[PDB]
Structure formats: structure tokens, C-alpha cells
């Protein structure tokens, strides 16, 4: 039951808690960025150098 | 120069209007513009200082 | 000033619950939002007036200025 | 080659406001160039036009531009 | 002491100003302003210290340097943006902080208040410099008036200025010697701020009702610490939003044109967080008067404590002075507009007018509506 | 008469707090600067270096900078000498100094367009308008010898002759090089030029906004979570009688 | 023409400090005089006042107020301290004058 499983295992021991903040942050980062980057770029299709980089690298 | 309500000068800082003689006519400015030491050396010559 | 030397307080029973045994969320739509309005409507008639007054003095001021700029079709009918 | 600007200024120069302005101007123009001694200038009137013209010039111009 | 959080000379201070500090239970956001003001002091000192890592105080290099600091230094642009804006978030919070304090008579904690003024003054002072630094058209011409502004003081004036800034005209020296002041000053603000809080702690924090709070008072930590961290992010979002979306939104663009000692820009609009007093200054046609007005325009805060008559502290139960108050806050927002406005009849008068209500509302109205309300209570 | 005309707003491709710059457009914007403005308008704060990865290619910009010779350091015999413009050089100055330029432009000083877009209220909107927008002075109004009427410019008399008409160049990408069109491209450039960070800066802004969104509530709960102890609370006065 | 009586009533409900449910005197800023005044208060009224203040604070701290019922009515407001406070003041003014 997630929340309960979580608390007991992750949030109870101040030792553990922290440990998940870290390993979590690593995950949040990696994911937040890719997501953000995508959201962004997509809202600017064909305007970015990544997008015209090709008229000297095709598309 | 060439702006103001006295056909001389206007200072965009606090609204002091000057006449073509350089005198202060309206605004908060306190004394009239500075008149340097000068003279004319001929028909077309003018030396300041 | 620290704690334990603040005031001679007698006979005040206070009951409060652990945050985990109660809900922080709170009771919006019941007591929540209501009081919010209870206040917008309480001071609106004490705050807004002057701001409103400014506004006018702002608009008036601006329009008039923007007007004193336009020519009097009759500053030269001749 | 034709400049989408000039074409779009053609349409725009026709919008009610432009006309009600372009007219206001035309008069002033020939109202000042008709006299010898007058301080009047048809700048104001000119703007009002422009102001209005270009305004839609903008609402559409960038559509035809790459 | 098994405590430690109280048995350690240093460590105590903390667990005595952030934990264990007795603070009134009932406290509105208007109490965050200050903890924020700090974060500004920081954001300013941190960013600026870092921006100074690239500045080059010297006419011929001064302007460009900054540009370089932006275009060339990684995130150097972000640093700048943040800095110039912290300036504002800084003045905003300060302007609000003063508000709050004014309308809860926190100005009754006198010293904590008087020091406060100093801070303002200094924050105004330090912000004056620094803006000179980038040496833009504004930077220059601001330097020239503000400084020259001490022209008014007779005898010691003309001289004090031709010293204030370098030699006899705002030139390189004045610049280097300003950078120095700027680099230095903030650290003074920091110090005084310490002195400010010291005086405060002597007298607990106020509280919105203006009546003893010993009856309640909660441990600063558990509560207010969070509350600050929150307010941190709240009035952090705007400031950041600006800095990442429309940085120069508040920044006059005219200053993007390197200084020219020969031409002051037609349309010299001082920085927004300065306009009010600015207006006051020009609407009192007389060098001296102009300045004087200004002088007191800000140097009046020192008198508010003496212009307090209400038998009650705050004015939450003083609906009368209460609106008089907003009449003031707005009378200020006005002076401001009238400041960002050229000098013509539509304005000007409006100007000197508000620039009259200002004083009166303070010097006279308040204390009058003050005693009056007491009598409407048999006091 | 302090009478002026305020420039209409154009929906630029990069106006949106979340919309980057059309890098393609800047590329052209660059060319129009290089081929027509970079002969009067200095632009000291940029350099081919930048173009790389933003609208040009390394090799592209390099050969692009070769296109100009620059005066460089002392000999062994110590004497300025010219040499092929490297990648790190800054865009060429057209005049050795201002008063030199002023003597080349009918007594006027073509301002450097590094920060032009943000040095004049209106930015692109202004600039664009200014370019695409000259015309005969209305009546009663007379521009003097050497100047050119342009309503949008204060004084309405500019020292810059309409520097842009149809075809003045030929965007190698196959773009109708119409005035309106080119003039657009110049402005989008002038922007990036004025603040290369643009995109990077907005993207950032994006994330910054998603953190506020996420963080503030979190701490709000936390703030409430913690205060509930008080919000909840209840008093009562029980003396003995 | 217009009763000061009629007026006070106004201001009273206008100040609305009774919405929190505390008497006028429960508000007067605590200056040297008042302190001495309140320090002369009979323990009855003291604890009364206290609670009223703590309740007031507790409310205020919750942003919410007291049911329309519990507000205190103007005529029923008890100037519990005015009397002491006054002696105080004159006591002082008596001393201040004597020290001259
Ligand atoms: C190239 C596309 C180009 C642009 C763009 C352009 C713009 C521009 C601006 C925005 C200004 C004026 C802003 C202001 O209010 O002062 C400006 C000014 C001048 N320019 Fe220009 N200009 C472009 C190209 C050229 C070219 C090729 C020349 C030289 C033939 C030229 C010259 C000038 C001059 C002179 C001015 C002076 C304005 C004045 O002081 O009256 N520009 N330009
Ligand atoms: C007390 C807070 C501070 C205030 C009020 C402040 C304000 C300013 C302002 C407004 C400017 C002009 C910015 C602009 O051009 O828009 C400035 C510039 C600068 N400040 Fe500060 N500053 C402060 C602290 C600092 C600190 C602590 C340092 C370093 C000691 C610093 C170093 C600089 C630098 C490098 C500049 C020049 C570059 C630039 O103009 O951005 N500032 N500061
Ligand atoms: C230098 C920046 C300043 C900082 C960082 C600062 C900090 C503080 C802080 C945090 C408090 C605690 C309570 C609160 O947040 O309101 C405080 C209180 C106060 N400050 Fe400041 N302050 C600053 C400037 C000023 C200024 C310019 C004034 C001057 C009018 C001022 C007046 C006060 C007052 C009156 C109080 C005490 C009453 C109360 O807290 O209710 N402060 N200040
Ligand atoms: C090593 C770190 C020691 C901590 C120093 C730091 C310390 O006083 O931190 C808090 C208490 C201080 N504000 C408050 O206490 C505070 C008081 C009443 C209410 C609220 N909240 C509103 O709801 C508060 O937030 C806040 O204004 O910062 C100051 C001022 C100081 O820091 C400043 O010198 C730093 C400057 C000098 C750089
Ligand atoms: C090194 C520090 C020295 C010499 C001391 C200087 C003192 C600084 C004081 C507190 C500061 C200016 C205050 C905000 C004063 C009261 C407000 C007045 C003020 O007036 C201005 C003004 O009249 C201007 O006219 C064209 C232009 C300006 O900027 C371009 C300003 C301006 O920026 C400020 C702000
Ligand atoms: S600087 Fe001239 S009006 Fe003040």
C-alpha cells in the first residue's frame, strides 16, 4: 500500500529518508529535464538550431 | 537646445527652461547658464577661453 | 525575552491535536473560502476607494495631457 | 516579387478606421498646402492614419513572412 | 547544560534567533517582509560579489565589462539579471516592510525602527551607486544629479561634491570610488541589519493586534521558520519570473546606451523605486527647496514614531486613520506615476499636490485623526 | 511639439514567454546585417564565435570570418599589420572612430546595433517599424537637407536613408527577399544579438516555473501541516468560581 | 444636531475590536501608565482580560472571528481599567509637578 510501504521503509529512519531524497533527486533530475527539454523544444519546432542544424545536416 | 517654453533651452532632468541668452526663466534651476570667457578674431572667427 | 518569563496566565485549558491526527488541508468551502470573502467584503470598502480615486486622477491626468497636445481646429480658421 | 507589406497595406488602407482617417488627413494636407502663411502641420492627422493603418498591418503582415 | 543548543556561545545565537525565539502566534505575511529583505541582502551580496568578479571599474572598460560579464561568462547574464532585479525585489520588500511597520505602529519599537530607516537610506544609497557602475547613459547622468544633489548644502556643498565624486566632473575616478562604496556598503547593511534585529529581540516581534502577546507566543522554529521558507519561494517566483522572462521589464532601456558626458537623454526617468521622492524634488522649484523636500521626503520616517497618538498601537481598530493610511499608500503610488511623467500642467500640479498630501497626511492628518479616534472612545 | 507616433505590435515568432527565437530567421537576420548594415552599423559585442551552433556551423562561421581582414598586434619590428579574421574576432567596425563615421553619414552617428533592440523602447517593434515606414512629410512640415522623414523616429527627421528595399540581397535559402520580409529578419537578429541568452533564458524560465508550481505547494502543505497544531487548537477559561 | 453618543456607537462597531470579543481597554497599547494600571488590576479582571486577549490572539491567528452573537455590545463594554489608569496618570502628574 505505497504510502504505508513508503513511510515504514523510506521515511521512518532519518537515515533512510535522506537516502531516498538523494537517489530520488537523481531520478527527478534526469526525468524533469528530459520532460522539460521536450516540452520546450516541441513548443518551438523548426526554430531551434537543433532544428535547422540540418540545412547543413538535412530535414 | 531647441526645446522648451522659452525658445532657448530645456533640461529634461527637472524641467528648467532657458531663454536664448541662457538665462533660467522657469523651473527649479537657480542661476543662469555659464557664460565662458571669449572673443571674435575676425568676421567668421570665434575663440572661447 | 525568552520562555517561562512571559506572563502570569491562570486557568487556560488548550487542546490541540498532532498534525498527523488532524488534517492541514483544512475545511475549505465550509469555513475556508467563506471567511476569505468575509474579508474581501469588509475592507474592500476601506482599501479600494483611494486606489480607485488614484486611477481616476491617473486617467484624467493622462487623457487631458494627450488632449492638450492635439490642435484646436480653430487656432487658425484663417 | 511583391512585398506582402504593400499588399496588406492595400487591404488595411481600406478598413473603416483608415478611411475615416485617410480622409481626415487628405483634407488637412490640402488644407495647409492651400495657404501661404500657416503654422499648421498635418503630422498629427498623419499619425492617426498610420497608427490605425499599421495596426492591422501588424495583425496580419507576419503571416505571409517566413 | 545537556542542551548544547544553548550551551554553545555560537550555537546558542542560532537556537535563540531561529529556534526557541518567542514570536507572536498571530502574524500576517507582512511579517515575512524582513526575512525576505535578508534573502535580498544575500541574493544581492552573493550575485554582486560574483558580478564583481568580472566588472572592470574604469570608464573606457566599465560599460563593456558588464556586457562581457553577460555575453562571455557562463550564466554571467543570469547573474546580472538576477542582481538588477534583486535590487527591486529588495526595494519592494523594503517598501512593503515599511508599510507593515507603519500600520501596526511597529515604529513604536523605535530603535528597531530607527535602525530600519538607516537600512532604507543605505539601501537607497548603495543602490544609487552600482547603478552608476555599468556606466550607461543613465548611470552617468544619475551620478551627475544625485551627487550634484548635495550642491544645495551651502558652504560645504560645491566642495563636498567635488570630492563626492572624483575631481570636478563625474569622470573615471568617481566611478572607481563608487564601485568601492558599492562593493563595501552592502556589508554595512548586513551589519546594521544585525544591529536592527538586536534591538528587535530586546522587544519581542510586534503582532497585528497591537496588544501583548505573551499570552500566546509560539517557538519561532517549528512555525515561522517554515513560514519564511514558504514566503521565500512565494516572493521569489515573481522576482525570478522577471529575471527569466522579462528582465528589463523594470529596467529602463535608455541605460543600454553607453554614457555620453555631453548629452543627457531627453526623457531621463530615474529608477522606479526612486520616483516618489523624485517627484517631490521636482515640484518644488528651488534648488534648495527641491532638495530639502526630498531630504524630508524620506528622512521623515524618523518622525513617524513621534507622530503617533492612537491609544492603541496598530490601527486595525482605527478604521478612520486606516483609510487615511491607504490614502497615503495610494498618494505614494501616485507621486510615483507623476514621477514617471514629464512636466506639463496635466501633471506637475497633480504632482506638487500629492507631494503635499504626502507630508500633511503624515505630519498632520494622521496625528489628528489619531487623537480624534481616541475621543470617539472617551479617551 | 513633443508630438510622437507609437509603433504597433507585431506578433514576433519569439514573443512568447515560452517561445524561442526562429533561428532560421536570425540566420537571415545576420546576413542582412552583414550585407547591408555592417557598412555603417558597428556591432562590437558579438563575434562569429557566437553564430556557431546558433545559426551557423563552425566551418561555416570560420570561413565566414575569413571574409574580413583585421589589424593585429605589433611586428617584431612592431607595426600594425592586417591578417585574415579568425573565429574569435568581433564583428568589424565600419569606421575607425565615431567622428569618422559622422563625417561619412551626413553629420550623423549611426548607433552601434549590439543592444539597439533594447536601447530604444519598442525593440524590434520599433526598429521594424522604423525601417519599413518612411514617407513624405505631411504638409507644413519640412525636413532639412540630408535628413529623411520617418514618422516613427523622434524629430521625424533621421540621418539614415531608407537602407532597405526589395531584393537588396538574396537570402540563399530561397526566401522572398521583400522589404517587409528582410526587415523582419534583421529585427529578429538584432534581438538575439542583443541577448543571445533568449532561448536558454526562457527554457530556464520554463523549468523555474515548474518548480515554483511544485515546490510552493509542497511547502505550503508543510506550512499548514505544521500550523494545524494552532489552527485546530481550542481555548477555555476555567477558574474555580 | 449629531450625538457624540450616536457617533461613539459608530466608531465602536467601526473599530470592530469587539468582533474579536475584547473590551475597549483590552486594546489600549500597553505603555508605562497602562502597565502600572493593569498591574493594579484585581486578579479577577486580570485573568479575565488575559484570556480575552489570548482568545483574541488565537482568533486573529486563525484569521477567523467570533460569532455575531459573542461580539460585545457597545453599551455592555466594561471600562475595567480606565479608573485605575486615571489615578495612575494623576498620581504621576502629581509627582511630575512636585519634582519641579
Ligand atoms: C540594416 C538592416 C539596418 C538597420 C537594422 C538600421 C537600423 C538603425 C537604427 C535602429 C537606427 C536608429 C535608432 C535611433 O532612434 O537613433 C539607425 C540609425 C542610423 N542608421 Fe541605420 N540601419 C541599417 C542600415 C544602415 C546603413 C547601411 C546605414 C549607412 C548607409 C545606416 C545609417 C544610420 C544612421 C546615420 C543612423 C542615424 C540616425 C540619426 O541620428 O538621425 N543604417 N539605424
Ligand atoms: C545591497 C544590495 C545591492 C544593491 C542595492 C545593488 C544594486 C546594484 C545595482 C542596481 C546595480 C546596477 C545594475 C544594473 O545595471 O541594472 C548594481 C551593480 C553592480 N553591483 Fe550591486 N548591488 C548590491 C550589492 C552588490 C554587492 C554585494 C556587490 C559586490 C560587492 C555588487 C556588485 C555589483 C556589480 C559587479 C555591479 C556591476 C555590474 C552591473 O551593473 O550589473 N552589488 N548593484
Ligand atoms: C535592511 C533590511 C531590513 C531587514 C533585512 C529587516 C529585518 C527585519 C526583520 C526580519 C524584522 C522581523 C519582523 C518582520 O519581519 O517584520 C524586522 C522588524 C522590523 N523592521 Fe526591519 N528590516 C530591514 C529594514 C527595515 C526598514 C528599512 C525599516 C524601516 C522603516 C524596518 C523597520 C522594522 C520594524 C518597525 C520592525 C519591528 C516591528 C515588527 O517586526 O512588527 N526594517 N526588520
Ligand atoms: C549564520 C546565520 C544566522 C541567521 C541570521 C538571520 C536571522 O535573524 O534569521 C531571521 C531570524 C531574520 N528574521 C526573523 O528572525 C523573523 C522575525 C519575526 C518574524 C519572521 N517571520 C515572519 O513571519 C522572521 O523571519 C531574518 O531577517 O534574517 C536576519 C536578518 C539574520 O541574517 C541577516 O543578518 C543576514 C545579513 C546580515 C546578511
Ligand atoms: C555615493 C553616494 C552618495 C554621494 C549619496 C547619495 C544619496 C542617495 C540618496 C539616498 C538617493 C539618491 C535617494 C533615493 C534620493 C532621495 C531620491 C532622488 C533621485 O533623484 C533623481 C533625479 O532627481 C534625477 O534627475 C534627472 C535622475 C535620477 O536618476 C537617473 C534620480 C535618482 O535616481 C534618484 C534616486
Ligand atoms: S538638471 Fe536641469 S532641471 Fe535639474
Grouping H, G, I as helix, E, B as strand and the rest as coil, residue B9 is strand
Q: What is the DSSP string of E276-329?
A: HHHHHHTTS-SHHHHHHHHHHHHTTTTTGGGS---SSSSSSS-HHHHHHHHHHH
**Could you tell me which residues come within 8 angstroms of residue E376 by beta carbon, excluding any fewer than 6 positions away?**
E320, G7, G8, G10, G11, G12
DSSP 8-class letter at E223 = I
CA E8, E9, E11, E13 dihedral sign is positive
Nearest to D53 by CA among D8, D21, D26, D13: D13
Nearest-angstrom CA–CA distance, E17 and C55 = 43
Q: How far, in Å, CA of C46 to CA of C53, rounded? A: 12
Which one of B6, B8, B16, B34 would you pick to mutate in the ligand 6 pocket, going by the greatest count of ligand atoms within 8 A of its CB?
A: B16
Distance CA G24, CA G28 (A): 7
C36: its cell numbers: 476569505
Q: Cα(G16)–Cα(G24) distance, rounded to whole angstroms? A: 10
Angle E76-102/E110-131 helices, nearest 10 degrees? 150
What whole-number distance in Å separates Cα of residue F113 and Cα of residue F190? Answer: 7
**Alpha-carbon dihedral C15, C19, C23, C29, rounded to 10 degrees:** 70
| Burial of F33 per CB tally in 10 Å (0-12, 13-18, 19+) | buried
Contact A38, F12 (CB under 8 A): no
Cβ-based neighbour number of residue E188 at 10 Å:
15
DSSP state of G76: G
CA distance E93 to G51: 35
φ/ψ (deg, to 5) at C66 = -60, -20
- Residue D12 and residue D50: Cα distance in Å, rounded? 10
Residue G84 structural domain: 1-100
Nearest by Cα to E207 from E27, E30, E35, E33: E27
Query: Got the DSSP string for D3-58?
Result: -HHHHHHHHHTTSHHHHHHHHHHHHHHHHHTT-SS----SHHHHHHHHHHHHHHHH
Rounded Cα gap, residues F39 and F33, in angstroms? 9
Q: How many CA atoms lie within 13 A of E246 on its CB side?
A: 9
Q: Distance between alpha carbon F90 and the CA centroid of its chain, in Å?
A: 16
Q: Distance between CA E369 and CA C38 in Å, rounded?
A: 27
d(CA F155, CA D23): 25
Atom of ligand 5 nearest to the CA of E295: 16
Q: What is the DSSP secondary structure assignment for residue G26, as one 8-state letter?
A: G
Q: Does the beta-carbon distance from D38 to C70 stay under 8 Å?
A: no
Residue from E317, E371, E373 whose CB has the most chain G CBs within 10 Å, to mutate? E317
Tell me, in Å, the resolution of the deposited structure.
3.7
Overall domain count for chain E: 1
The CA E38 to ligand 4 mean position distance, Å, reads: 7
Query: How many other CB atoms are found less than 10 A from the CB of residue E22?
Result: 21
Tell me the domains of chain F and their CATH numbers: 1-196 (1.10.760.10), 197-241 (1.20.5.100)
| CA–CA separation, G23 and G45 (whole Å) | 12
CA of E279 to the centre of ligand 6 (A): 13
| Cβ(E265)–Cβ(F240) below 8 Å | no
Residue E271 structural domain: 1-379
Q: Is the CB of B13 under 6 A from ligand 6?
A: yes
C-beta separation of D48 from F6 below 8 A: no
Q: Which of F26, F16, F91, F77 is nearest to F53 (CA)?
A: F26
DSSP of F127-154, one letter per residue? HHHHHS------TT--PPTT-EE-TTST
Residue C25 structural domain: 1-78
B34 Cβ contact partners less than 8 Å away, ≥ 6 residues apart: B22
- CATH number of the domain that residue C34 is part of: 1.20.5.210
CATH number of residue G58's parent domain:
1.10.1090.10
Angle of helix E237-245 versus helix F198-232 axis, rounded to 10: 170
- The β-bridge partners of E219 are E22
| Residues linked to residue C65 through DSSP beta bridges, in sequence order | none
Read off the DSSP letter of residue F55: T
Number of compact structural domains in chain G:
1
**Grid coordinates in use for E190?**
548586513
Q: Residues G40, G67: contact at Cβ < 8 Å? A: no
CA-to-CA separations, A17 to A25, E222, F226, in angstroms, rounded: 12, 19, 19
- Domain spanning D1-66: CATH superfamily: Ubiquinol-cytochrome C reductase hinge domain (1.10.287.20)
CA of E34 to the centre of ligand 4 (A): 7
Smallest Cα distance from E325 to chain G, Å: 15
Sequence-ordered strand ranges (E) for F66-143: 69-72, 81-84
Q: Do the Cβ atoms of E209 and E31 come closer than 8 Å? A: no
Query: Which residues of chain E does F220 touch, with a Cβ-Cβ cutoff of 8 Å?
Result: 230
Give φ, ψ of G24 to 5 degrees.
-45, -70
CB neighbour list of residue E263: distance below 8 Å, 6 or more residues apart = E137
Q: How many CB pairs under 8 A join F and G?
A: 13
C-alpha cell read off for G63: 484569521
Domain made up of A1-59: CATH architecture = Up-down Bundle (1.20)
Residue of G8, G10, G61 to mutate for E, most E C-beta atoms under 10 A: G61
Torsion-angle region of C12 (φ positive above 0: left; ψ -120 to 50: alpha; else: beta): beta
- Extents of the domains making up chain A: 1-59
What are the backbone dihedrals phi and psi of residue E235, each rounded to the nearest 5 degrees, phi first? -75, 45
Amino acid at each position: 500500500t505505497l504510502t504505508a510501504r513508503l513511510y515504514s521503509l523510506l521515511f521512518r529512519r532519518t537515515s533512510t529518508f535522506a537516502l531516498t531524497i538523494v537517489v530520488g533527486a537523481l531520478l527527478f533530475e534526469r526525468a524533469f529535464d528530459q520532460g522539460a527539454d521536450a516540452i520546450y523544444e516541441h513548443i518551438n519546432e523548426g526554430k531551434l538550431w537543433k532544428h535547422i542544424k540540418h540545412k547543413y545536416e538535412n530535414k | 537646445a531647441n526645446a522648451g517654453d522659452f525658445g532657448g533651452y530645456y533640461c529634461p532632468c527637472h524641467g528648467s527652461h532657458y531663454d536664448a541668452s541662457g538665462r533660467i526663466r522657469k523651473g527649479p534651476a537657480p542661476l543662469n547658464l555659464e557664460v565662458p570667457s571669449y572673443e571674435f578674431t575676425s568676421d567668421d572667427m570665434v575663440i572661447v577661453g | 525575552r525568552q520562555f517561562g518569563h512571559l506572563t502570569r496566565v491562570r486557568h487556560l485549558i488548550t487542546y490541540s491535536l498532532s498534525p498527523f491526527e488532524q488534517r492541514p488541508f483544512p475545511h475549505y468551502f465550509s469555513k475556508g473560502v467563506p471567511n476569505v470573502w468575509r474579508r474581501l467584503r469588509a475592507c474592500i470598502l476601506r482599501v479600494a476607494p483611494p486606489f480607485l480615486a488614484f486611477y481616476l486622477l491617473y486617467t484624467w491626468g493622462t487623457q487631458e495631457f494627450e488632449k492638450s497636445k492635439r490642435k484646436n481646429p480653430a487656432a487658425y480658421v484663417n | 516579387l511583391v512585398d506582402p507589406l504593400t499588399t496588406v497595406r492595400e487591404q488595411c488602407e481600406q478598413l473603416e478606421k483608415c478611411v475615416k482617417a485617410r480622409e481626415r488627413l487628405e483634407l488637412c494636407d490640402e488644407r495647409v498646402s492651400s495657404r501661404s502663411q500657416t503654422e499648421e502641420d498635418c503630422t498629427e492627422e498623419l499619425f492617426d492614419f498610420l497608427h490605425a493603418r499599421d495596426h492591422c498591418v501588424a495583425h496580419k503582415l507576419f503571416n505571409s513572412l517566413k | 547544560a545537556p542542551n548544547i543548543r544553548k550551551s554553545h556561545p555560537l550555537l546558542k545565537m542560532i537556537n535563540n534567533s531561529l529556534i526557541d525565539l518567542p514570536a507572536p502566534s498571530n502574524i500576517s505575511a507582512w511579517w515575512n517582509f524582513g526575512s525576505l529583505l535578508a534573502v535580498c541582502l544575500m541574493t544581492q551580496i552573493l550575485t554582486g560579489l560574483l558580478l564583481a568578479m568580472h566588472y572592470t571599474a574604469d570608464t573606457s572598460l566599465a560599460f563593456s565589462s558588464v556586457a562581457h560579464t553577460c555575453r562571455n561568462v557562463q550564466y554571467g547574464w543570469l547573474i546580472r539579471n538576477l542582481h538588477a532585479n534583486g535590487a527591486s525585489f529588495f526595494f519592494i520588500c523594503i517598501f512593503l516592510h515599511i508599510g507593515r511597520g507603519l500600520y501596526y505602529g511597529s515604529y513604536l519599537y523605535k530603535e528597531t525602527w530607527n535602525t530600519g530607516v538607516i537600512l532604507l537610506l543605505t539601501l537607497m544609497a548603495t543602490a544609487f551607486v552600482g547603478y552608476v557602475l555599468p556606466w550607461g547613459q543613465m548611470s552617468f547622468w544619475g551620478a551627475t544629479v544625485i551627487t550634484n544633489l548635495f550642491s544645495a548644502i551651502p558652504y560645504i556643498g560645491h566642495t563636498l561634491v567635488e570630492w563626492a565624486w572624483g575631481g570636478f566632473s563625474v569622470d573615471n575616478p568617481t566611478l572607481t570610488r563608487f564601485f568601492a562604496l558599492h562593493f563595501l556598503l552592502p556589508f554595512a547593511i548586513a551589519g546594521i541589519t544585525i544591529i536592527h534585529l538586536t534591538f528587535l529581540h530586546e522587544s519581542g516581534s510586534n503582532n497585528p493586534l497591537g496588544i501583548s502577546s505573551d499570552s500566546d507566543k509560539i517557538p519561532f522554529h517549528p512555525y515561522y521558520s517554515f513560514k519564511d521558507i514558504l514566503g521565500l519561494t512565494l516572493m521569489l517566483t515573481p522576482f525570478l519570473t522577471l529575471a527569466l522572462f522579462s528582465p528589463n521589464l523594470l529596467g529602463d532601456p535608455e541605460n543600454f546606451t553607453p554614457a555620453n558626458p555631453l548629452v543627457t537623454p531627453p526623457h531621463i526617468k530615474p529608477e522606479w523605486y526612486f520616483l516618489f521622492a523624485y517627484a517631490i524634488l521636482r515640484s518644488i522649484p528651488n534648488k534648495l527647496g527641491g532638495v530639502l523636500a526630498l531630504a524630508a521626503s524620506v528622512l521623515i520616517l524618523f518622525l513617524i514614531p513621534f507622530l503617533h497618538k492612537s491609544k492603541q498601537r496598530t490601527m486595525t481598530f482605527r478604521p478612520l486613520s486606516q483609510t487615511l493610511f491607504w490614502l497615503l499608500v495610494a498618494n505614494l503610488l501616485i507621486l510615483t506615476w507623476i514621477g514617471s511623467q514629464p512636466v506639463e500642467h496635466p501633471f506637475i500640479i497633480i504632482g506638487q499636490m500629492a507631494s503635499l498630501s504626502y507630508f500633511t497626511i503624515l505630519l498632520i492628518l494622521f496625528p489628528t485623526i489619531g487623537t480624534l479616534e481616541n475621543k470617539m472612545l472617551n479617551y | 511639439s513633443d508630438l510622437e507616433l507609437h509603433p504597433p505590435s507585431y506578433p514576433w515568432s519569439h514573443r512568447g514567454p515560452l517561445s524561442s527565437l526562429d533561428h532560421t530567421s536570425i540566420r537571415r537576420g545576420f546576413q542582412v546585417y552583414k550585407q547591408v548594415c555592417s557598412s555603417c552599423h558597428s556591432m562590437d559585442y558579438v563575434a562569429y564565435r557566437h553564430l556557431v551552433g546558433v545559426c551557423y556551423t563552425e566551418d561555416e562561421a570560420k570561413a565566414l570570418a575569413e571574409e574580413v581582414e583585421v589589424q593585429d598586434g605589433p611586428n617584431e619590428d612592431g607595426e600594425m599589420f592586417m591578417r585574415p579574421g579568425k573565429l574569435s574576432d568581433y564583428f568589424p567596425k565600419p569606421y575607425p572612430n565615431p567622428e569618422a563615421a559622422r563625417a561619412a553619414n551626413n553629420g550623423a552617428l549611426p548607433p552601434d546595433l549590439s543592444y539597439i533592440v533594447r536601447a530604444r523602447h519598442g525593440g524590434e517593434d520599433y526598429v521594424f517599424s522604423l525601417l519599413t515606414g518612411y514617407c513624405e512629410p505631411p504638409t507644413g512640415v519640412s525636413v532639412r537637407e540630408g535628413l529623411y522623414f520617418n514618422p516613427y523616429f523622434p524629430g521625424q527627421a533621421i540621418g539614415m536613408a531608407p537602407p532597405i528595399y526589395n531584393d537588396v540581397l538574396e537570402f540563399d535559402d530561397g526566401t522572398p527577399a521583400t522589404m517587409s520580409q528582410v526587415a523582419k529578419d534583421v529585427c529578429t537578429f538584432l534581438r538575439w544579438a542583443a541577448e543571445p541568452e533568449h532561448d536558454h533564458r526562457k527554457r530556464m524560465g520554463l523549468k523555474m516555473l515548474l518548480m515554483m508550481g511544485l515546490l510552493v505547494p509542497l511547502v505550503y502543505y508543510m506550512k499548514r501541516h505544521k500550523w494545524s497544531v494552532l489552527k485546530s487548537r481550542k481555548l477555555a477559561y476555567r477558574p474555580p468560581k | 444636531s449629531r450625538w457624540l453618543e450616536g457617533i461613539r456607537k459608530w466608531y465602536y462597531n467601526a473599530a470592530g475590536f469587539n468582533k474579536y470579543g475584547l473590551m475597549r481597554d483590552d486594546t489600549i497599547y500597553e505603555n508605562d501608565d497602562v502597565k502600572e494600571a493593569i498591574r493594579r488590576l484585581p486578579e479577577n479582571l486580570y485573568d479575565d482580560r488575559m484570556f480575552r486577549i489570548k482568545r483574541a490572539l488565537d482568533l486573529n491567528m486563525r484569521q477567523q472571528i467570533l460569532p455575531k452573537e459573542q461580539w460585545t455590545k457597545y453599551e455592555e463594554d466594561v471600562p475595567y481599567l480606565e479608573p485605575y489608569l486615571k489615578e495612575v496618570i494623576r498620581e504621576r502628574k502629581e509627582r511630575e509637578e512636585w519634582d519641579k
